[PDB]
Amino acid sequence: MEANIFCTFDHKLSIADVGKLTKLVAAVVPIPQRLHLIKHYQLGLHQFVDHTRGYVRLRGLLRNMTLTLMRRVEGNQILLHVPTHGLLYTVLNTGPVTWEKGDALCVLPPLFHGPLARENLLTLGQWELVLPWIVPMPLALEINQRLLIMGLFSLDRSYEEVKAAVQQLQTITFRDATFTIPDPVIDQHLLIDMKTACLSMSMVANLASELTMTYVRKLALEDSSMLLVKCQELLMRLDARPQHVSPDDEIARLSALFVMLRQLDDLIREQVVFTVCDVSPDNKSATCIFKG
Amino acid sequence: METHLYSDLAFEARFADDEQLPLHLVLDQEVLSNEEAETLRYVYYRNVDSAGRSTGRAPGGDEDDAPASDDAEDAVGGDRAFDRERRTWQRACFRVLPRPLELLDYLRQSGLTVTLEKEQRVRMFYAVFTTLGLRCPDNRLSGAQTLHLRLVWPDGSYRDWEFLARDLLREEMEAN
Amino acid sequence: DEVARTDEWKGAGVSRLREVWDVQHRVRLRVLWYVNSFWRSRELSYDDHEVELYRALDAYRARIAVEYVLIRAVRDEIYAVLRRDGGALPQRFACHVSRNMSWRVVWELCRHALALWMDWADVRSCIIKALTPRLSRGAAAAAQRARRQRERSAPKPQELLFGPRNESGPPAEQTWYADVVRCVRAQVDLGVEVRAARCPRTGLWIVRDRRGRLRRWLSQPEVCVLYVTPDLDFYWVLPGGFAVSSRVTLHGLAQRALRDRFQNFEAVLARGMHVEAGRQEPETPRVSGRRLPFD
Amino acid sequence: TQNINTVDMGLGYTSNTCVAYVNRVRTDMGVRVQDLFRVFPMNVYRHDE
Amino acid sequence: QALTARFFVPEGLVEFEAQPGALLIRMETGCDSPRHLYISLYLLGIRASNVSASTRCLLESVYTASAARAALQWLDLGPHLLHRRLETLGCVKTVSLGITSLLTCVMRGYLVFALMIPKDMYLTWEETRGRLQYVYLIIVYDYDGPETRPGIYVLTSSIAHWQTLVDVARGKFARERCSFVNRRITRPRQIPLCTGVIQKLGWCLADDIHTSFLVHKELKLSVVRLDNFSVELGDFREFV
C-alpha cells in the first residue's frame, strides 16, 4: 500500500512560510488521488471551493476524498502520511471548535465564524491553503440535519417567508460557540437526498404497526409529564383492546420499520473518521484512533 | 407522461376538500419557442367565475374592488393586495420533452394503449406535459367559466392566455 | 392480489384528443382525456346558460380594457393640460433652439406624432412598464422611506459632529421608460428604457442610454418622444426640448383588475437558486435536448 | 536518498544546445482526421432518426 | 500477515469450487443436523436471475450431488430473504479432495491469490479505469414478477464513501426500487425488508484485472478475475 505521500512545492519557500508550515505539523489535510507523488495544487480545498455553487456539492466532494496526516517539512518537500485503520495517531485541532474526551469526530467543509477574519495559510500567489473542519459528532450531525431541513422547508416558498426561517436555522450554537452555514443553495444532490428521505418517510408511515400508531395517544390518556405535554403540544394541531395482536407479524413489521429508520439515518450521519482519547488541556491537540 | 398520472392522483386526493377537477394539456411549437420551452421553470393556472372573480378572493367582494388611489404612499394596497394576488395563483406539475416526437408513437412506447377516433399523426418539434384544474363550486360545472394559463421563465418574463371552458369541454362532457 | 392504480391506468389508456384555441385566437393547444380518470366516476353535471356567457365576455372585455383606457386617460390629460396652459410650452430638456425656423411645420409634425402614437397603443407601451415596479411589495416601503427621508429637518450641529455620518440621499441617475415615434416614416418604438439626469448648469433634463452614450433624438425635427417617471409623472416632448407636464390619472381603474392584469411576479425557490435572499444565481438549470440528458 | 543543490555561476546563458541528428519519425504523418465525435461525446442532433 | 481459517465441507459441494481461487459463503439452515452449510459464489449462480441461460444450464449440470441439491432446497425455502441467512467468509486458496474435503480461507490478508468471479455476475458503473478500485458484493431483489427471485452481482468501483455508492446504486437501480414499492402495495399482507444489500470486501489495483476461462470435467466457463487482491470483510448493510 502507498503508506507515504510526497508533495513538492513549485514556488520558492520563504523562511516565514516554511516556519508557518512547520507549526502545522501533524495536522489533517485531504488528498484526492492517493497517488505517490502529488503537486502542491491539490493539497487542500482551494482548488475546489466555489462560493457561487452549493455547499452541498462541497460537502459531497469532501466526504468522497481521502484523509492524511502531516509530517515535518524540508526544502521544497512536504511529506504526508496516510493513516492505517485501527492504529493510534496525533492530530491538531484545525478549527475553533472545542473537543471533549470520549466522543467521535467527523470531517466537514469550513464554516463561517464570528469575526469572519479567517487566517490565511500559505497564500502562495493566487493559490491558498485551506484545511477541512474536524468536528465532534453532535455539531456535525446537527449541521447536516439542519441543512437537510433547510432544503426540505425552503422549497416552493417565497423569499419573504423563507427569510425569517433561514435566519432561525443557519445559526448553530454548540458548546458555547456559534457557527453559520456558508452557502446553503439547493442542488440536484440535495434533491436526490430529499427524494430518498420522502420515500423512506412514506414507507415508515405506511408499514408502521397499529400499536406504534396509537401508542402516544394511549399514554397521553394514561399519564401526564413534561415530555408528554411537549409531545401533545406539538401534535395538538393534529389531535381499547386491540382487535388483533400477532407477535410474529409485529416482529416482522418492526424489522421493516428498523430497515426504514436505518436508511433514513444514513442521510444524516456522516462517516466517522476519528475516535479520541483524552485531549490536551489547551484544546489544540488530541490523540485519536483512525477509522476508515 | 408521469406528470399526468401523478397530478390525476393528487387532484383525486384534494377534490374532497377543494373540489377541483383535473385537465390534462400538451403544448407544442405553436405555443412557445424551443429556447423558452427548454428553459421552462414555472406554470401557473387560475379559475374565474362567470361574472368575473377569482378562486382565492372572497366570492362576494373585496376591498380590492375600490378604485385605485394614485397616492404617493400606497399605490395599490401594496403588501396585502400583492399577497392576495399571489394567493389566487396556483402551481401545477410539468415535464418537458426537448427531443422531437409524435404523440401516438410515444404513447404506445409508453404503457398507454391509445385508440383514437382516427389515428391522426401529429408531429411536435418539442413537447411539454402539463395538467391544470378547473373548479366547480358543487357538481354543477358552468361552461362560461374562463381558465388562465401562465408560464414563467427565470428572468421574470411571462406569457399568458385565457380559455373558455365551453371550448375545452365542447364534446367530452356533452357525452356525459 | 390486486394491482395498483398505475398499472390499470396505463392499461386503460386514453381515447380522445381535441384542439382548443385561446379566447384571442393567439395560441392553440391540445388536451388529453384518460378513460380511467376519477373525473369520469364523479358524474358531475354541466350547463352554459347564455346570460352567464354574456356576463363572462363582458367581464373579459373589461379585463383587456385595463391598458387601453389608461392610454386614453393619458390622451385626456395631454389635451386637458394643453387647453389649460392655453398653448404655452416651457422648455424642459436641454437642447439649443433656432429662432428663424418655420415652427408651424414642427407643430404640425407634433400633431401627426400625437395621432400616430395613439393608433399604435399597446400593452408594450411605456406606462405599463412604469406601473410594473410600482405594484410590487417593495414599492410601498420604498415610497414610505422616501417620503420620511425627504421630509426631514436640517440636522443640528450636534448630530453632524457625532455619531453617524450624513445619511445618504437620493441619486441623480433616474430610470425612465419611454415611447418614441417617428413621422418621416410612419413607425413607432414602444418598449424603450432610458437613463435620465438633471443638468448641473440649468435644471433641464439630459437623456442617455443605459450604455452611457448621450442620446440624439431630441434634435431631430421628425420625432416626438414620450417619457414617464417611476413615480408615475408624465412628460411629452416635441423637437426643441419643449414639454407638456401632467400626472397619469390611473384612478379610473379598479385595483382588482389592475393587479390581475400585470405585476412583477415574485419567485419561489426551485432547483439551483439560492436559499439566501439576493445571492447570485448559478448557471441556469435548462433541461436540454441539444445534449444527452444527465441521469 | 541524496539531496542535490545546484547554483548558477554565470550572469548569462551559460549552456547552449542544438537539435543535432534525426532518427526515424514516431508519428505516421498520416491524414486520418481526428474523431471529433469522441472528443465531444455529449452532443447529439435533435431529431433522433 | 494473512489471517488463515479452516473449514470442512462435504464432497458434493466441492468439485466446481475445487479450483484454488474461489469465494465462499456460509448459509444457516433450519434443519437440525446440517446446522450450517458452506456455499460458494458459483453455486449462487444456479438461482441468480442475472445468470444467462447457458451458464445456468452448466451450473445445473455440475452441481447434481444430493447434498448440494438439499442445500439449494434450503436456500429456495427462504421466503423473500437471503441475507438474513447468508454470511460471508472470504477468499480461499487450498483444497484437499475426498469423501469429506478440507480447505482453508483467509479473512484478512493479501498473501496465486487471485479471486475469481463468474462473467455473468460482473458489472461496473464506470468504463473509465480508476487507478484505485474497491469491489463489493451486492444482492438485489426483483419484485415485478409473481414471487421474488434474487439478483446477484459483484461490482468494482472507485467510490469509497458509502453514501455516494448508495446514491449511484439508487440511480442505476430505480426500476428495482419502484418494483419494491409495487410489491409493498400489491400484496399488503406481505412485508419485504429491502431492495438490496451492500457488503464490502475489496482492495486491489485496477491494472491487475484479468478475463479468463475456466474448466471442470471438460465443461467450460467464462470468468472475470482479480489477481493482486486483498480481502477485508464487512457488515451486511441494507439500502433503499
XYZ file of C-alpha atoms in Angstrom, chain A residues 21-273:
253
model
C 4.088 25.242 7.717
C 6.386 23.745 10.370
C 3.887 24.841 13.020
C 1.160 22.904 11.157
C 2.942 19.531 11.514
C 0.625 16.599 12.355
C -2.485 18.448 11.150
C -5.069 16.929 8.799
C -5.264 17.603 5.047
C -7.200 15.709 2.331
C -5.717 14.268 -0.879
C -7.846 13.308 -3.919
C -5.845 10.814 -5.958
C -3.831 8.866 -3.316
C -1.009 8.761 -5.878
C 2.532 8.508 -4.526
C 3.645 11.923 -5.837
C 1.322 14.937 -5.990
C 1.744 18.604 -6.871
C 1.009 21.417 -4.425
C -2.264 22.422 -6.119
C -4.353 19.503 -4.829
C -3.183 19.939 -1.212
C -6.259 21.499 0.379
C -9.748 22.520 -0.686
C -8.802 25.736 -2.521
C -8.880 24.096 -5.965
C -12.496 23.005 -5.447
C -14.053 25.725 -3.261
C -16.547 27.980 -5.053
C -18.966 30.184 -3.098
C -21.179 30.572 -6.185
C -22.228 26.905 -6.048
C -23.630 24.599 -3.418
C -22.202 23.911 -0.009
C -23.871 20.533 -0.592
C -21.562 19.967 -3.567
C -18.537 20.845 -1.430
C -19.804 18.541 1.332
C -20.040 15.653 -1.123
C -16.666 16.404 -2.699
C -15.088 16.475 0.765
C -16.756 13.299 2.038
C -15.613 11.444 -1.078
C -11.923 12.313 -0.672
C -9.248 10.578 1.412
C -7.686 11.773 4.666
C -3.995 12.200 5.503
C -1.821 13.480 8.348
C 1.039 15.980 8.198
C 4.764 15.444 8.764
C 7.749 17.748 9.163
C 8.963 19.546 6.065
C 12.180 20.390 4.234
C 13.278 22.444 1.236
C 10.586 22.253 -1.464
C 9.428 18.955 0.085
C 6.345 18.392 2.245
C 5.588 14.871 3.478
C 2.084 13.484 4.009
C 1.290 10.288 5.921
C -1.859 8.265 5.257
C -3.269 6.682 8.442
C -3.889 2.952 8.767
C -7.212 1.720 10.154
C -7.103 0.885 13.854
C -3.781 2.462 14.841
C -3.209 5.466 17.115
C -2.206 8.919 15.867
C -1.826 12.547 16.957
C -3.961 15.267 15.338
C -4.200 19.033 15.843
C -7.460 20.983 16.000
C -7.763 22.972 12.773
C -10.950 24.831 13.698
C -12.020 26.760 16.797
C -14.473 24.054 17.915
C -13.981 22.663 21.419
C -13.010 18.989 21.742
C -14.079 16.692 24.607
C -12.946 13.312 25.922
C -14.614 10.187 24.567
C -16.732 11.415 21.637
C -16.353 10.726 17.926
C -15.181 13.115 15.207
C -16.343 13.894 11.666
C -14.886 15.881 8.759
C -16.856 18.723 7.158
C -16.167 21.748 4.920
C -15.292 25.036 6.647
C -17.928 27.242 8.264
C -18.347 30.963 8.808
C -17.449 32.079 12.325
C -17.977 35.174 14.458
C -15.188 37.520 13.331
C -15.205 36.379 9.658
C -11.487 37.254 9.673
C -10.227 33.760 8.867
C -6.453 33.415 8.986
C -4.793 32.763 5.629
C -2.288 29.904 5.389
C 0.440 29.625 2.734
C -1.019 32.163 0.290
C 1.458 31.262 -2.444
C 0.493 33.520 -5.333
C -3.156 33.188 -6.291
C -3.227 29.782 -4.561
C -4.010 29.339 -0.871
C -4.018 26.520 1.663
C -7.327 25.836 3.416
C -7.975 22.991 5.858
C -11.169 20.994 6.404
C -13.019 21.130 9.708
C -12.703 18.249 12.161
C -15.887 18.350 14.227
C -17.241 16.255 17.096
C -20.317 14.177 16.314
C -23.172 16.306 17.785
C -22.256 19.526 15.960
C -21.618 17.817 12.613
C -24.828 15.790 12.830
C -26.786 18.900 13.842
C -25.442 20.974 10.954
C -26.050 18.284 8.321
C -29.557 17.685 9.682
C -30.316 21.407 9.644
C -29.028 21.741 6.075
C -31.415 18.973 5.026
C -34.156 20.801 6.947
C -33.307 23.979 5.024
C -33.665 22.092 1.758
C -36.949 20.447 2.727
C -38.596 23.584 4.150
C -37.425 26.284 1.742
C -38.812 24.540 -1.359
C -41.806 26.208 -3.051
C -41.898 29.244 -0.756
C -41.388 32.927 -1.457
C -38.228 34.660 -0.268
C -40.201 36.700 2.280
C -41.419 33.726 4.330
C -38.079 31.955 3.825
C -36.167 34.995 5.105
C -37.036 34.588 8.796
C -36.753 30.794 8.775
C -33.263 30.857 7.266
C -32.046 33.309 9.904
C -33.506 30.988 12.542
C -31.917 27.879 11.004
C -28.500 28.997 9.748
C -27.095 29.888 13.179
C -25.795 26.916 15.179
C -24.809 27.133 18.841
C -22.611 24.307 20.068
C -20.822 24.084 23.417
C -20.673 27.876 23.939
C -19.678 28.602 20.309
C -21.580 29.987 17.314
C -21.429 28.944 13.655
C -23.153 29.682 10.339
C -23.505 27.622 7.146
C -21.774 29.469 4.267
C -23.956 28.850 1.181
C -26.962 26.533 1.601
C -28.194 26.691 -2.012
C -30.378 23.818 -3.212
C -28.609 21.427 -5.587
C -29.559 18.292 -7.523
C -27.694 16.232 -4.909
C -29.957 17.692 -2.224
C -32.976 16.855 -4.394
C -31.864 13.214 -4.650
C -31.342 13.099 -0.879
C -34.789 14.641 -0.364
C -36.404 12.129 -2.731
C -34.875 9.263 -0.755
C -35.985 10.898 2.508
C -39.555 11.266 1.233
C -39.684 7.643 0.073
C -38.368 6.332 3.398
C -40.691 8.606 5.390
C -43.728 7.402 3.451
C -42.651 3.773 3.815
C -42.281 4.044 7.599
C -45.599 5.910 7.699
C -47.236 3.004 5.863
C -45.720 -0.154 7.340
C -45.803 1.020 10.971
C -47.969 -1.209 13.149
C -51.225 -0.143 14.790
C -49.763 -0.195 18.310
C -46.977 2.150 17.223
C -49.604 4.433 15.667
C -51.817 4.591 18.768
C -49.146 4.329 21.489
C -48.684 8.012 22.341
C -52.449 8.617 22.395
C -52.976 5.840 24.946
C -50.099 7.011 27.142
C -51.205 10.652 26.984
C -54.586 9.413 28.189
C -52.842 7.364 30.891
C -50.008 9.559 32.194
C -49.019 13.229 32.229
C -45.439 14.518 32.238
C -43.397 17.352 30.760
C -42.156 15.213 27.858
C -45.677 14.018 27.058
C -47.004 17.563 27.445
C -44.438 18.768 24.898
C -45.299 15.932 22.510
C -49.017 16.732 22.757
C -48.307 20.455 22.329
C -46.537 19.531 19.096
C -49.330 17.207 17.947
C -52.239 19.279 19.314
C -52.909 20.739 15.857
C -53.277 17.168 14.555
C -55.252 15.790 17.517
C -59.375 -0.012 23.819
C -58.279 -3.618 23.406
C -56.514 -4.148 20.054
C -58.683 -6.282 17.795
C -55.571 -8.112 16.547
C -52.348 -8.942 18.374
C -49.780 -11.021 16.475
C -46.234 -11.302 17.862
C -44.684 -12.758 14.688
C -46.233 -10.226 12.303
C -45.347 -7.498 14.804
C -41.723 -8.698 14.809
C -41.543 -8.673 11.013
C -43.230 -5.256 10.755
C -40.852 -3.769 13.319
C -37.903 -5.243 11.422
C -39.148 -3.442 8.308
C -39.554 -0.280 10.380
C -35.938 -0.655 11.529
C -34.625 -1.032 7.992
C -36.563 2.113 7.049
C -35.282 4.126 10.026
C -31.762 2.796 9.425
C -31.964 4.087 5.863
C -33.327 7.467 6.959
C -30.497 7.856 9.484
C -27.813 7.308 6.827
C -28.905 10.550 5.144
C -27.695 12.500 8.198
C -24.868 10.626 9.939
C -21.536 11.401 8.303
C -18.962 8.613 8.436
C -16.694 8.624 11.484
C -13.000 9.288 10.867
